[PDB]
RNA sequence: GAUGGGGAAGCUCCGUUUCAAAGGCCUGAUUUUAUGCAGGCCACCAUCGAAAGGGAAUCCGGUUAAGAUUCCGGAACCUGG
RNA sequence: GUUCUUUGUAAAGUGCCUUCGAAGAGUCGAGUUGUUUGGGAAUGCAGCUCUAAGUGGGUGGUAAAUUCCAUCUAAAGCUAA
RNA sequence: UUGACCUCAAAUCAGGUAGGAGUACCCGCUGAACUUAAGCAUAUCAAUAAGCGGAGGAAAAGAAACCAACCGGGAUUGCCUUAGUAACGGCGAGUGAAGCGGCAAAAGCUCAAAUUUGAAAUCUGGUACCUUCGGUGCCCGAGUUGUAAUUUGGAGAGGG
């Protein structure tokens, strides 16, 4: 079964996967900006990334907002260049989804997360969907098979960098590329 | 207690290392209502010591008991 | 409601808690023109403790017990005495 | 000025050591140093 | 005053394109019914099955096991969240051969399998039996749901992306 | 000025008048002292913010090295039980 | 030292056959905007659009095309010095 | 009239969890100007200072969607080199890194995707080598249950 949800979420738009992801959009928006876990929405290419399964149960949701970049202050100002001068149109070398993984965190990081998924697409945000695994907890680190999660550092580092989205947006290239710096490097 | 330690160690009842505490105490007390020229105290201090002796052996024979 | 685990001990206590006869030139008057024991006290006076301290300690009776925040950290009270305790008379301790 | 504790204590201290040099310590077999050194003077630096 | 949060769902969950997609509607149109209170038949048999004609109780397990052709009259559930899971059966049940069977209560083919929920359930075992399942029911049951997903697209409505269980049961290389 | 929440990479910003379970309390209450219930008021939209505003109830005499509408003498009124 | 030995259905290494199991999507790549690089029609990053494939993709330090060829398996993980 | 399925809560009712701190040094985000260009915008300063959010004994990286000509080499990390050179640049002022070579330290590995729908998991109780809320057992009781095992570079075969 797995597979078939796999390659059948894989075709977006398109009869089923439109008149759905409306229904859902429709709901979901309403519901609180993060609004915690139900039992994982799309559980198809969810175990690609470790699935559900931790720690027992805990994959929460939230709504990021979409867009580019809110240059505080008013001004400039600051001379301007080599804007500086720029404002209104910086863009975000965050990761839109990622800010989702980080507050999803704070919201309560009584658990570690593992990884993060999408789901929709407003003009008004991006519907992603964080997963978790309470290490402070039970099998988790009992039955673990993967207690990785549960080690010291490894844990709130969901926003360290050391994520996933944050691996990718920054160096997990190799060759071709000045992405494991730090570095600066050099002198 | 006023030794020993060695001594209020064993073993009159929390009803019994009772007024020798109260009793040390009454003394520290009038011990104090000396109040009069010097003053050394000199006892004061030892009275006083001797006061927690028996206070800190009070609260350990009580509490190995909730360690059951 | 419920539990499983708690507190420690019940330390202590808490009480005492009467200072150290507080004393002197006017106070000892006070204890003889007036006959109302000049005791002190610990900051913190439990207010009608006091009553329940002397009452109990020097045990004789009180009848009022206005009592001044003294200039040092001296919480020095002001007890009198019913037609029992003659100040003098209970001033056997001081 | 009717004060409040916080500030009571407080004044009080200001009493409490506002005490020239012990005289004992002068001669603690040691060294000890002379003059109180910290020494308030309700008239020169001033409370809070 | 939150219920409608759901309320409100289902609302839009019918007034838009009041069919929309595949047997997506299936699960909706021909669901409201389906599969009749002659269903009760089969969740009778398959209630004391567990004595008469074992069980069954597998989700990925009867999928794979309608691809391994071995299955029985399994019985697909209205209810789904996301109803994606059980969307699949909708095609691989003629796509192989077994008889389809959009039957009721979710929860009650988690009542026939002595667990929770649950997923979609069916069979393979009788000889008593055998007959008054597979006969009555089997015929009235693989007429409709079958005959059924015929048209049924519309009626509504889709069938959508068989170039899905294209994709899939081809895939296998 | 917290909280129902919403903005912000974020310290934090914004909102107390437009968003479950309400907030509790009450008399009677299923009662032999828990606690539903009969019924009522029901976002009370927390709380802080006045030693000149609002604001329960004392006065006369005597007293000291230095207090006092208190201490003490007499005579009082308020509040809760 | 092991007075034990609950198992030995406990696990490992040939040539024979089964497009043998088939492997990560709002991702890959692209347009554009900013940004960054020694990066150069040649960096990565992130926005907004568009959005694959499965003898598929990524790359090959000039853009197109068409042949070829070379070289690894991405969009889920851990891991001592 | 009586059970559940399901999204939602409310419990001082059980038990853990975080929140602050913090010299250095590590992961991030976010971002100046002063400065040099003898001017000043380009740019340099500098992916630098300041601001913010997260770790540790290190951290981070790491079994390649690499480097490569043939030749071939074979996760990271560091050093010496490569090199003030390929490039970048009012090609001005200045930027300026790589990759078969010698070193230093050495490790390799598990998931998703596949079946017999679980006999695998939390607890809490009784008892247990372990002496009270506790290292792990056993049996049993509620609960979990798209999360029991082979298989994951290479394939072991995966099945026969």
Redesign the pocket.
């Given at each position: 079964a797995?597979?078939y949800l796999?390659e059948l979420?894989?075709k977006?738009?398109s009869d089923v996967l439109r008149f759905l992801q409306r229904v859902r959009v429709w709901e979901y928006r309403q519901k609180?900006?993060i609004?915690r876990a139900?039992?994982?929405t799309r559980?198809d290419?969810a175990?690609?990334?470790?699935?559900?399964?931790?720690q027992?149960?805990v994959i929460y949701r939230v709504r990021v907002?979409?867009?580019?970049?809110?240059?505080?202050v008013p001004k400039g100002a600051?001379?301007?260049?080599?804007?500086?001068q720029?404002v209104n149109?910086?863009?975000?070398?965050?990761?839109?989804?990622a800010?989702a993984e980080?507050?999803v965190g704070?919201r309560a990081?009584?658990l570690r997360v593992l990884?993060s998924?999408?789901v929709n697409?407003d003009?008004t945000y991006?519907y992603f969907e964080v997963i978790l695994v309470d290490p402070?907890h039970?099998?988790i680190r009992?039955?673990a098979?993967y207690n990785?999660i549960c080690?010291?550092?490894?844990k709130?580092?969901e926003?360290?960098?050391?994520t996933?989205?944050?691996?990718?947006?920054?160096?997990?290239?190799?060759?071709?590329?000045?992405?494991?710096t730090?570095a600066?490097?050099?002198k | 207690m006023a030794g020993v330690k060695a001594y209020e160690l064993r073993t009159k009842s929390k009803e019994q290392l009772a007024s020798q505490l109260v009793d040390l105490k009454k003394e520290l007390a009038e011990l104090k209502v000396q109040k009069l020229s010097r003053p050394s105290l000199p006892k004061i201090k030892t009275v006083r010591k001797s006061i927690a002796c028996v206070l800190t052996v009070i609260n350990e024979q009580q509490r190995e008991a909730?360690?059951? | 409601?419920?539990?499983?685990?708690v507190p420690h001990y019940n330390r202590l206590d808490s009480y005492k808690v009467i200072e150290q006869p507080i004393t002197s030139?006017?106070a000892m008057k006070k204890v003889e023109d007036?006959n109302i024991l000049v005791f002190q006290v610990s900051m913190k006076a439990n207010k009608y403790q006091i009553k329940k301290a002397v009452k109990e300690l020097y045990e004789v009776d009180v009848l009022?017990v206005?009592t001044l925040v003294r200039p040092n950290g001296t919480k020095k009270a002001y007890v009198?005495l019913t037609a029992d305790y003659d100040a003098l008379d209970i001033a056997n301790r001081i | 000025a009717?004060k409040?504790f916080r500030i009571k204590q407080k004044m009080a201290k200001a009493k409490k050591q506002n005490r020239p040099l012990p005289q004992w310590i002068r001669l603690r077999t040691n060294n000890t140093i002379r003059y109180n050194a910290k020494r308030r003077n309700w008239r020169r630096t001033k409370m809070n | 005053?939150?219920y409608t949060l759901?309320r409100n769902t289902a609302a839009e969950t019918f007034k838009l394109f009041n069919k929309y997609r595949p047997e997506t509607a299936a699960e909706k149109k021909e669901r409201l019914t389906k599969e009749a209170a002659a269903v009760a038949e089969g969740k009778s048999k398959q209630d004391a099955s567990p004595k008469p004609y074992a069980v069954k109780?597998?989700?990925?397990?009867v999928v794979?096991?309608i691809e391994?052709k071995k299955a029985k009259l399994v019985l697909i559930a209205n209810d789904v969240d996301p109803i994606e899971?059980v969307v699949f059966l909708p095609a691989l049940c003629k796509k192989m051969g077994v008889p389809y069977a959009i039957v009721k209560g979710?929860?009650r083919l988690?009542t026939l399998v002595n667990?929770?929920?649950?997923?979609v359930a069916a069979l393979t075992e009788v000889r008593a039996e055998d007959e008054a399942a597979l006969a009555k029911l089997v015929s009235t049951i693989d007429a409709n749901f079958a005959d059924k997903y015929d048209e049924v697209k519309k009626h509504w409505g889709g069938g959508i992306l068989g170039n899905k269980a294209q994709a899939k049961m081809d895939?296998?290389?």
């Open positions: 797995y597979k796999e979420q894989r977006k738009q609180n900006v609004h139900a039992r994982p559980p290419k175990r690609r990334l470790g699935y559900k399964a931790k027992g149960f907002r979409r867009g580019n970049r809110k240059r505080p600051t001379y301007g260049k080599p804007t500086n720029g149109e910086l863009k975000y070398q965050r990761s839109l989804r800010t980080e507050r704070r990081a009584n990884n998924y999408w697409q003009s991006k402070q039970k099998a009992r039955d098979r990785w080690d010291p550092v490894h709130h580092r926003a360290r960098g050391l996933a989205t944050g691996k990718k947006s920054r160096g997990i290239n190799k060759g071709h590329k000045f992405n494991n730090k600066g490097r050099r | 909730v360690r059951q | 409601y419920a539990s499983k685990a030139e006017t007036g009022k206005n009198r | 009717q409040s | 005053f939150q759901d109780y597998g989700l990925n397990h794979a096991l391994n899971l979710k929860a988690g667990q929770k929920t649950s997923a895939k296998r290389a």
